[PDB]
mmCIF file of C-alpha atoms in Angstrom:
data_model
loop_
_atom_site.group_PDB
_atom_site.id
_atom_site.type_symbol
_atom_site.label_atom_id
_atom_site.label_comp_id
_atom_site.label_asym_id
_atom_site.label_seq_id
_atom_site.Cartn_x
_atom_site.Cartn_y
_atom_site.Cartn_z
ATOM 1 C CA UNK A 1 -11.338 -2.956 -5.965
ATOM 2 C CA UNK A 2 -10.176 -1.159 -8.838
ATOM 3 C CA UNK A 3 -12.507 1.684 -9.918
ATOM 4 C CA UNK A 4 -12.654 3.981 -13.191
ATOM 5 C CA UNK A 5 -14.990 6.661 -12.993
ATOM 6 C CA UNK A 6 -16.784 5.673 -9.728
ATOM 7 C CA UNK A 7 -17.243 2.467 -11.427
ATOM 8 C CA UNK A 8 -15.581 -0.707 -11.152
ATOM 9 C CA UNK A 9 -13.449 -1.938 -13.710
ATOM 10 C CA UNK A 10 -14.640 -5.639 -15.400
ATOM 11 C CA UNK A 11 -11.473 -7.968 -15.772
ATOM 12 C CA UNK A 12 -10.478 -9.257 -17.873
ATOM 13 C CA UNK A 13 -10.088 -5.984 -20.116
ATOM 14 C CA UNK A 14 -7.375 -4.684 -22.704
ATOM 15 C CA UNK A 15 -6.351 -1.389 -21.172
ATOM 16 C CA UNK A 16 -6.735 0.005 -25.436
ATOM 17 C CA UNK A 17 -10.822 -0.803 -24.757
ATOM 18 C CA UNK A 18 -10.430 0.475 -21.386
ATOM 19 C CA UNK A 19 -8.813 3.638 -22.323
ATOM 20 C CA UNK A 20 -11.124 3.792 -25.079
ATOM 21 C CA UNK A 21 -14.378 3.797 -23.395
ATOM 22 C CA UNK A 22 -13.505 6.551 -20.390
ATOM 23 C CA UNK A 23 -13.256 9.698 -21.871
ATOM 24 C CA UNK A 24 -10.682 10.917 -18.981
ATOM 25 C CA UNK A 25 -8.402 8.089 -19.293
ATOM 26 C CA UNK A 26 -8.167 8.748 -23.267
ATOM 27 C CA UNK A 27 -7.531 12.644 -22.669
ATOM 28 C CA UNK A 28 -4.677 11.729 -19.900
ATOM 29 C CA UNK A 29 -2.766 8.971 -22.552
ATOM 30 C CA UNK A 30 -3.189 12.316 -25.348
ATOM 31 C CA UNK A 31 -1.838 14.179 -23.104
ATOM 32 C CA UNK A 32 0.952 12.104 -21.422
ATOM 33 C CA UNK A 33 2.179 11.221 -24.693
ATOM 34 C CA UNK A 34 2.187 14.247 -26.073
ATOM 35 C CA UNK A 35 4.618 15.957 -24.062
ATOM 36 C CA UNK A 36 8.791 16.527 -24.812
ATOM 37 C CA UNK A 37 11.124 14.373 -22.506
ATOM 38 C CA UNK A 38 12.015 16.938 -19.855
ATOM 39 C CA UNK A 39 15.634 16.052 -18.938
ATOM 40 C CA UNK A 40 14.825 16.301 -15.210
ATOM 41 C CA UNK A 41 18.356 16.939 -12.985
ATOM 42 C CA UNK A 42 19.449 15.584 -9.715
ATOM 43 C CA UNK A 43 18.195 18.221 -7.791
ATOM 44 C CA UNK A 44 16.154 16.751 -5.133
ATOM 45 C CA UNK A 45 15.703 13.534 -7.199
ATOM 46 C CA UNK A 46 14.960 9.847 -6.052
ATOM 47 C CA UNK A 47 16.005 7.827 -9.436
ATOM 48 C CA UNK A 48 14.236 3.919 -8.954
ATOM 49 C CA UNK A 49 15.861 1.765 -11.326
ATOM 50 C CA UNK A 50 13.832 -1.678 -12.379
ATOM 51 C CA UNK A 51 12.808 -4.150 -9.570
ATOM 52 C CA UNK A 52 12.619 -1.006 -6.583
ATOM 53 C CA UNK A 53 10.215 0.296 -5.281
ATOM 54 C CA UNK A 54 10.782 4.187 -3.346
ATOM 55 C CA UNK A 55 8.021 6.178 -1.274
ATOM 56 C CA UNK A 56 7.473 9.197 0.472
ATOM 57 C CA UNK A 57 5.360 11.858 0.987
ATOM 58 C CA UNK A 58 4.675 16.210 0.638
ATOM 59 C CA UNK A 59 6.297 16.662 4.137
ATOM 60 C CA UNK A 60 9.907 14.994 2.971
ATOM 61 C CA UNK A 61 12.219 17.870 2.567
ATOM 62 C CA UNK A 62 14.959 16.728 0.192
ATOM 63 C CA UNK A 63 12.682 14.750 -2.354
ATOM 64 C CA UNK A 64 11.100 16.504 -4.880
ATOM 65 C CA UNK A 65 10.690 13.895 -7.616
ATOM 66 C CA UNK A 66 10.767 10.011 -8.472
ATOM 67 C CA UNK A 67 11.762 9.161 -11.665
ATOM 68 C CA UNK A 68 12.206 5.869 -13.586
ATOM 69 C CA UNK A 69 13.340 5.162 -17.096
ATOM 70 C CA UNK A 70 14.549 2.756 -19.451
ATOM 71 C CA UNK A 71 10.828 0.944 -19.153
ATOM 72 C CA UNK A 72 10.600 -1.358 -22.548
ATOM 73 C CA UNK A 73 8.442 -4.112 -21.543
ATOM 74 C CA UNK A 74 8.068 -2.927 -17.744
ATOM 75 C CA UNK A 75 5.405 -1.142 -16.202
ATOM 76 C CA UNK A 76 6.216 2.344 -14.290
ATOM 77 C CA UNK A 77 3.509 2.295 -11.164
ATOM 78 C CA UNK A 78 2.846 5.349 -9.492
ATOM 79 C CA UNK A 79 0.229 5.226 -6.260
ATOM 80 C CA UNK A 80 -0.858 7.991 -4.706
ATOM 81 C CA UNK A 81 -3.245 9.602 -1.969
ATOM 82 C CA UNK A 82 -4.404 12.466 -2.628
ATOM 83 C CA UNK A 83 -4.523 14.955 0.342
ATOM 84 C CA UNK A 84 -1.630 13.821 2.557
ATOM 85 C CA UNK A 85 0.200 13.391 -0.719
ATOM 86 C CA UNK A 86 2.074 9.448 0.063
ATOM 87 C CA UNK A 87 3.497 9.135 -3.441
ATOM 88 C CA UNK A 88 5.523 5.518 -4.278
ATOM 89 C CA UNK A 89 6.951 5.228 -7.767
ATOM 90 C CA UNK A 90 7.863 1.230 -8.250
ATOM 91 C CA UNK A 91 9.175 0.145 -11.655
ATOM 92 C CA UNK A 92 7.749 -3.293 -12.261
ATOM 93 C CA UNK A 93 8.802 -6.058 -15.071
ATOM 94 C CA UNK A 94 6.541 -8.906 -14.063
ATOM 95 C CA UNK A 95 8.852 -10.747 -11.615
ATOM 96 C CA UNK A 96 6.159 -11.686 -9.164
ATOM 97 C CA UNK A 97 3.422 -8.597 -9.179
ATOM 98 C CA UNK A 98 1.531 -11.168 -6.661
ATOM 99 C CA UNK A 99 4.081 -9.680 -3.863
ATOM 100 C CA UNK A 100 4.238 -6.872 -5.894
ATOM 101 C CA UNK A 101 1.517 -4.892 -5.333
ATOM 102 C CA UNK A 102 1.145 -5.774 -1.559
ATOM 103 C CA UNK A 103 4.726 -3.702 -1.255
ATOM 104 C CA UNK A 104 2.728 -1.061 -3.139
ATOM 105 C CA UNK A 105 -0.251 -1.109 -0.543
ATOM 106 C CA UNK A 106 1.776 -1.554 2.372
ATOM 107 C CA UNK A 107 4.017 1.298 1.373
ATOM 108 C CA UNK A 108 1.082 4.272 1.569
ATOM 109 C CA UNK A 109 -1.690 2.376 3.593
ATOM 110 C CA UNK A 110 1.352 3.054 6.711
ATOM 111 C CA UNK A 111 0.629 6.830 6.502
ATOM 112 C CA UNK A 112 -2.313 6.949 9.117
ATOM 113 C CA UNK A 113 -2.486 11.078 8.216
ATOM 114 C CA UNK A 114 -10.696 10.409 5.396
ATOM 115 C CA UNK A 115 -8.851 12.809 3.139
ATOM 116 C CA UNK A 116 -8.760 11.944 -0.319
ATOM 117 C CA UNK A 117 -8.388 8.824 -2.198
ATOM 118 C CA UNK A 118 -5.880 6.284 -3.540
ATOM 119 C CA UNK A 119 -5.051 7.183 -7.469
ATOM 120 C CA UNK A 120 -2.965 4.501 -8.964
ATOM 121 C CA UNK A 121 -1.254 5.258 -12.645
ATOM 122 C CA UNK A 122 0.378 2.998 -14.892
ATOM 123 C CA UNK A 123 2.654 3.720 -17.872
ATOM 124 C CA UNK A 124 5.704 1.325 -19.811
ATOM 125 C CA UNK A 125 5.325 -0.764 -22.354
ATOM 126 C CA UNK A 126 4.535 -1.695 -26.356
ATOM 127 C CA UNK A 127 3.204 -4.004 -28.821
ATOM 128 C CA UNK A 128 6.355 -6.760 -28.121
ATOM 129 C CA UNK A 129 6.358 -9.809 -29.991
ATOM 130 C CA UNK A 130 6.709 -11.938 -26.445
ATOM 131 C CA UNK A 131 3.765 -9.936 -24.630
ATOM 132 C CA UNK A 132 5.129 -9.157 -21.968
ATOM 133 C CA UNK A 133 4.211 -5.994 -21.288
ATOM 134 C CA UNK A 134 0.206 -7.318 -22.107
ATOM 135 C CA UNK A 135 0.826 -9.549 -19.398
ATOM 136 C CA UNK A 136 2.216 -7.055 -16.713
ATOM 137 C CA UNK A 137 -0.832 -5.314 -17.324
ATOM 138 C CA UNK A 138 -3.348 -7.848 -17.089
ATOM 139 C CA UNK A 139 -1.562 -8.978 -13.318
ATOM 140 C CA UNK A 140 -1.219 -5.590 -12.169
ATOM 141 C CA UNK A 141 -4.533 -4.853 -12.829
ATOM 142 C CA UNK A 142 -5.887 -7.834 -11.573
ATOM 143 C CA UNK A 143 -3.840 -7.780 -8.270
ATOM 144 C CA UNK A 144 -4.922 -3.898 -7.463
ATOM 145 C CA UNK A 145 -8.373 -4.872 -8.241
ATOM 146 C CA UNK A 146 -8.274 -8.317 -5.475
ATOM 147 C CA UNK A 147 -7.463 -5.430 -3.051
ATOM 148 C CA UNK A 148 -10.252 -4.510 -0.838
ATOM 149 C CA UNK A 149 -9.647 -1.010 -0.563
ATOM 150 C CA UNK A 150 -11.317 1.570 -3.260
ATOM 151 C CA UNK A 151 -8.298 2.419 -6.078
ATOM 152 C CA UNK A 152 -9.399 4.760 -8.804
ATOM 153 C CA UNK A 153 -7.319 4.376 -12.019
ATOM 154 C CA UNK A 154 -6.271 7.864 -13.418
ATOM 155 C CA UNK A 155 -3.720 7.054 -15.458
ATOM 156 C CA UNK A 156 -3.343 4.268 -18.350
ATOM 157 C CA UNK A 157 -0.883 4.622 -20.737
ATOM 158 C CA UNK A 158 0.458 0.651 -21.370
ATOM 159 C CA UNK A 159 1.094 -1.311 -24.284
ATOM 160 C CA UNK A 160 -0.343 -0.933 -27.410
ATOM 161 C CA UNK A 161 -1.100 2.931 -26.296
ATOM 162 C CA UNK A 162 2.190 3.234 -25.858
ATOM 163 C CA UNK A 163 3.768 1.796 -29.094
ATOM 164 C CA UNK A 164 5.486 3.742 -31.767
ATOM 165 C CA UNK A 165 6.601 2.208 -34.751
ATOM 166 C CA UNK A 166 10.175 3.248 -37.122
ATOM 167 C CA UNK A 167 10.040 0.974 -40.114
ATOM 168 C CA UNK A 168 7.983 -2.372 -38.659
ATOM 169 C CA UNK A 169 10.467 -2.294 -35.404
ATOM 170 C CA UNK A 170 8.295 -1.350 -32.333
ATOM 171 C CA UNK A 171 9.393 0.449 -29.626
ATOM 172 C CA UNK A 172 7.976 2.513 -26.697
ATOM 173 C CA UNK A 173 7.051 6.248 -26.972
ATOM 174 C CA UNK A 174 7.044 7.135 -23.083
ATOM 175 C CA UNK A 175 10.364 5.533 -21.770
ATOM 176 C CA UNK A 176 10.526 7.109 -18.523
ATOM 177 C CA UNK A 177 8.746 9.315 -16.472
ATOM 178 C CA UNK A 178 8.928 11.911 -13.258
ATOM 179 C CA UNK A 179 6.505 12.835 -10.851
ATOM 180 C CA UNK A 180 6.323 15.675 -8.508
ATOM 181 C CA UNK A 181 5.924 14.709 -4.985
ATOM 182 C CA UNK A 182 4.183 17.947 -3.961
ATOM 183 C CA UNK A 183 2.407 18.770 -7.045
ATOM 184 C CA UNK A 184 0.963 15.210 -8.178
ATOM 185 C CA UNK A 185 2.202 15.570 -11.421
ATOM 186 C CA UNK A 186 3.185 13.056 -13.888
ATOM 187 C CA UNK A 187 4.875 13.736 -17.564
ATOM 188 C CA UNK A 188 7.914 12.063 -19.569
ATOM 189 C CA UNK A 189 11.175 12.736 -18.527
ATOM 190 C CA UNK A 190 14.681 11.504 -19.043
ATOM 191 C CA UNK A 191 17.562 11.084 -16.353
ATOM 192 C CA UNK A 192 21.283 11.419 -16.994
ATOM 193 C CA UNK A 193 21.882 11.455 -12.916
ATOM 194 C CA UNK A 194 20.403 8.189 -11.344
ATOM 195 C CA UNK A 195 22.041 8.387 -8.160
ATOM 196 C CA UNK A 196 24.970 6.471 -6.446
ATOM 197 C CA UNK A 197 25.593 2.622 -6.011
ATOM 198 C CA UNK A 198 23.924 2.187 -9.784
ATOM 199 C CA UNK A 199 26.108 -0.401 -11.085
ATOM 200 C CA UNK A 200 25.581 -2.651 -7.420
ATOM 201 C CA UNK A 201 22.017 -2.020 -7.867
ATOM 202 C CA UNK A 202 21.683 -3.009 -11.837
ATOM 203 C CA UNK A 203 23.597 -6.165 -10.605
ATOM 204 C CA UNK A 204 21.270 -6.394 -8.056
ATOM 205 C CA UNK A 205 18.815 -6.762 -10.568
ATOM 206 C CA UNK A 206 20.393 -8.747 -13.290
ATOM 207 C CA UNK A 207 21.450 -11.702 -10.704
ATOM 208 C CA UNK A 208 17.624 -12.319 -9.796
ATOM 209 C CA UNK A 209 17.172 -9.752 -6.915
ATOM 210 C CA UNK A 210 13.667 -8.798 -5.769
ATOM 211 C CA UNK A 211 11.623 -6.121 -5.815
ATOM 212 C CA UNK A 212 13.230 -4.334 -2.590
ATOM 213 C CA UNK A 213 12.503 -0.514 -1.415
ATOM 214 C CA UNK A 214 15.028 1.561 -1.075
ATOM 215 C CA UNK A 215 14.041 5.084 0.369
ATOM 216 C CA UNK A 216 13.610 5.204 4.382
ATOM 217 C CA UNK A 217 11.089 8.781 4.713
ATOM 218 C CA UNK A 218 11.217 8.943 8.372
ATOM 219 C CA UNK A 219 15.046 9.571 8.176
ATOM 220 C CA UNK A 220 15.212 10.545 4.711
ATOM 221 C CA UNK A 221 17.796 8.217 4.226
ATOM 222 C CA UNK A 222 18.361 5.857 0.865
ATOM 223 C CA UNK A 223 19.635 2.860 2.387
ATOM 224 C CA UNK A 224 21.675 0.724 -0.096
ATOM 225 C CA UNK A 225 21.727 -3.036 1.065
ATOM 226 C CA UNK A 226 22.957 -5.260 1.848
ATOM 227 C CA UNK A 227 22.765 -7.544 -0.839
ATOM 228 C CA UNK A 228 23.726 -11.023 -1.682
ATOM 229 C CA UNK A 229 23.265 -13.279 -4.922
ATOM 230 C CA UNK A 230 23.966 -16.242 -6.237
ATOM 231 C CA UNK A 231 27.475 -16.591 -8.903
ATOM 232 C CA UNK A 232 25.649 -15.264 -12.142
ATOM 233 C CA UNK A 233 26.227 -18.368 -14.684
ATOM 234 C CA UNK A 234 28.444 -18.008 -16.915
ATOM 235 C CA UNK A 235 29.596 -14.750 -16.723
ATOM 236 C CA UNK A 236 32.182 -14.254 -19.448
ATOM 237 C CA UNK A 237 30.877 -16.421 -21.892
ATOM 238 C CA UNK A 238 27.942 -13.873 -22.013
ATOM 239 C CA UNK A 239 30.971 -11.008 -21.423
ATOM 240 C CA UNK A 240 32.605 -12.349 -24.776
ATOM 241 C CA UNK A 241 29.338 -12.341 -27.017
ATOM 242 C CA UNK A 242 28.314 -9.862 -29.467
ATOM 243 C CA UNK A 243 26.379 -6.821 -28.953
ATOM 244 C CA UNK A 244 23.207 -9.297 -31.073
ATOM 245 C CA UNK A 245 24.109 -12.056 -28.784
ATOM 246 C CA UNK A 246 23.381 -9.771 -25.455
ATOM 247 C CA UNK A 247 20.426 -7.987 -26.636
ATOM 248 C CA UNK A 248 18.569 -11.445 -27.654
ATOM 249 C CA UNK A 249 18.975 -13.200 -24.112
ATOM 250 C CA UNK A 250 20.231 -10.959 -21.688
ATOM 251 C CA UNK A 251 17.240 -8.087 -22.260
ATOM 252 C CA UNK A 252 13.213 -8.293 -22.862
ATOM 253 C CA UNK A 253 12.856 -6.320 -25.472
ATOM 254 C CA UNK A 254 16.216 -7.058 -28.344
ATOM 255 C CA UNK A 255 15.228 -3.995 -30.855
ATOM 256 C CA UNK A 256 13.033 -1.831 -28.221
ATOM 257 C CA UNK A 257 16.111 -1.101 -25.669
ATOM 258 C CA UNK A 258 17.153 2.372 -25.082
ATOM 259 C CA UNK A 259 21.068 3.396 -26.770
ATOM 260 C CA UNK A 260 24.115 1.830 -24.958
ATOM 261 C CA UNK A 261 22.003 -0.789 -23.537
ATOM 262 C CA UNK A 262 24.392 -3.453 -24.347
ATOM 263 C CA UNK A 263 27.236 -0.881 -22.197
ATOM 264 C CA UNK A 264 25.415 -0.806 -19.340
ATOM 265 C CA UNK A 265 24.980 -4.644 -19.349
ATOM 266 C CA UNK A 266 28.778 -5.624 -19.673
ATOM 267 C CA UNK A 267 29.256 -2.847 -17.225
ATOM 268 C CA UNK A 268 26.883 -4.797 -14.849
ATOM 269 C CA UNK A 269 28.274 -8.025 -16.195
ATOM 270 C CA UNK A 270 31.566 -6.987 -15.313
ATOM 271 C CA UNK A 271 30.388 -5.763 -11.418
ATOM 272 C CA UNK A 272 29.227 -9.914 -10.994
ATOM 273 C CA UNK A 273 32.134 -11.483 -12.204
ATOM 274 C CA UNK A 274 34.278 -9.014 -9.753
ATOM 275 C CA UNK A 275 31.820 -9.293 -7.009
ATOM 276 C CA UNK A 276 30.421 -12.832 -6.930
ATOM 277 C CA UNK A 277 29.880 -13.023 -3.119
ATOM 278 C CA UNK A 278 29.288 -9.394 -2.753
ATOM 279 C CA UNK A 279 27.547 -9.459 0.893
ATOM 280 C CA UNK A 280 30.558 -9.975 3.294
ATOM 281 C CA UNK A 281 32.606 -7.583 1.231
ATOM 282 C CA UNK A 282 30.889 -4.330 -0.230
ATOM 283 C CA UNK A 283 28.961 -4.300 3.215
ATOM 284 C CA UNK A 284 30.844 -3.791 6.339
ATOM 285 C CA UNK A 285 29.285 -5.061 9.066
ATOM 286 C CA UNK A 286 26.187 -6.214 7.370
ATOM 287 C CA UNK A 287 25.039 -2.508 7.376
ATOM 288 C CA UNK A 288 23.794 -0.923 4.639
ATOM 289 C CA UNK A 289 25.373 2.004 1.812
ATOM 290 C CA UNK A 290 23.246 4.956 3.856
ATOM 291 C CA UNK A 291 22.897 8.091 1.228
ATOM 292 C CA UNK A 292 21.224 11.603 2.681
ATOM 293 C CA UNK A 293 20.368 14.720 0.417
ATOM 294 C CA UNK A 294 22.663 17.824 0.750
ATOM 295 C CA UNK A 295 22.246 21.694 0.480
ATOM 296 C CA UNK A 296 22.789 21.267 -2.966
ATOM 297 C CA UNK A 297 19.768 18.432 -3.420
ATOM 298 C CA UNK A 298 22.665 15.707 -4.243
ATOM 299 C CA UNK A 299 22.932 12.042 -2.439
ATOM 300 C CA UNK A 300 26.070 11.927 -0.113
ATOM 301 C CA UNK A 301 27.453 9.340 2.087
ATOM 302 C CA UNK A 302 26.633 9.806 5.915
ATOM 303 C CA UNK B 1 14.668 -4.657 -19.869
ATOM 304 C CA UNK B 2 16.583 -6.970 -17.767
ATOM 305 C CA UNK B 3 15.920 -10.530 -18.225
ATOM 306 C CA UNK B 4 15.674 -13.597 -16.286
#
């Protein structure tokens, strides 16, 4: 079940009153929210972009942190436990948290090395006018709680705590953040290096992938594919629209999206039209795009 | 966020 101070949590329950009536979960959202964006480098750094899912633990030596941005209506889900340090950073948006969350589980309950606990935290999200981050929240919440081993929530910083408005258009204070494999901690950050194969992995995404992990710890390899989707429909009528017309069906959140949102889409629109079958072809062999830190804490081909 |  899912447990806040020893107790278990009653579903359902709007994280605001949750938050609200645990003293420690109200001084970590203070806290969490009050912080600067660190602009967190490469160095050492496992970026998961939406839909992935990446874990590992204290005893990796080229991952320091997992980081995830750009989290509008999506929920950033970090699980953790505590002792032997298994740390997996997912970025969910709501695409099926019922499969969801068993890839969470799976992903730390395989490190057999009594010890500590499981710590789950949960940050992403605002006040949007389609509630979909409300909605994330009430399924992830409900799906760690219909597990039967003991999860203690430490972190809650979702929805309506995390909404900022700038004259009546709401938008999410915490976009992003990092956390430090070794150290357990969690604070904003920003990412201007989010690793190779990002365009294939945003179209990935965008032409209905699912939620996939991409981070191999016993190697330490990030293993890229391969993939293979279905023609996106109509892929330069939505290339031709306006910046308005991208923003209002192409993305969650039309006035909550992060600057050159719309550039990164017909970037990723342009990567399906060029690569409609893209698994014969950008995969030789059927093997997967195999990455490995270097000396200097950067991704490189093996 | 990406949509459907």
């Amino acid at each position: 079940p899912l447990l806040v101070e020893g107790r278990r949590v009653r579903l359902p329950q709007s994280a605001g009153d949750l938050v609200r009536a645990h003293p420690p979960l109200e001084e970590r959202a203070r806290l969490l929210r009050g912080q600067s964006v660190q602009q967190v480098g490469p160095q050492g750094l496992l970026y998961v972009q939406q839909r992935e899912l990446a874990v590992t633990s204290p005893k990796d030596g080229s991952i320091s942190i997992l980081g995830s941005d750009d989290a509008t209506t999506s929920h950033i889900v970090v699980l953790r436990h505590t002792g032997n340090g298994a740390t997996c950073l997912t970025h969910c948006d709501g695409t099926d948290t019922k499969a969801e969350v068993p890839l969470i589980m799976n992903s730390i309950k395989s490190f057999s090395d009594q010890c500590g606990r499981l710590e789950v935290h949960l940050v992403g999200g605002f006040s949007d006018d389609r509630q979909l981050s409300q909605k994330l929240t009430h399924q992830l919440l409900s799906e760690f709680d219909r597990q039967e081993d003991d999860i203690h929530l430490v972190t809650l910083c979702v929805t309506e705590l995390n909404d900022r408005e700038e004259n009546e258009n709401h938008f999410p204070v915490i976009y992003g953040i990092a956390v430090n494999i070794k150290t357990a901690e969690i604070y904003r950050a920003s990412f201007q290096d989010r690793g190779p194969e990002e365009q294939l992995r945003a179209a990935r995404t965008l032409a209905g992938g699912p939620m996939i992990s991409i981070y191999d710890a016993e190697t330490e390899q990030l293993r890229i594919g391969p993939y293979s989707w279905t023609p996106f429909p109509h892929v330069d009528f939505w290339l031709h629209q306006d910046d308005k017309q991208i923003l209002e069906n192409l993305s969650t959140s039309p006035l909550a999206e992060p600057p050159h949102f719309v550039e990164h889409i017909r970037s990723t629109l342009m990567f399906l039209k060029k690569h409609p079958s893209p698994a014969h072809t950008l995969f030789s062999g059927n093997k997967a795009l195999l990455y490995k830190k270097n000396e200097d804490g950067l991704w490189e081909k093996i | 966020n990406f949509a459907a």
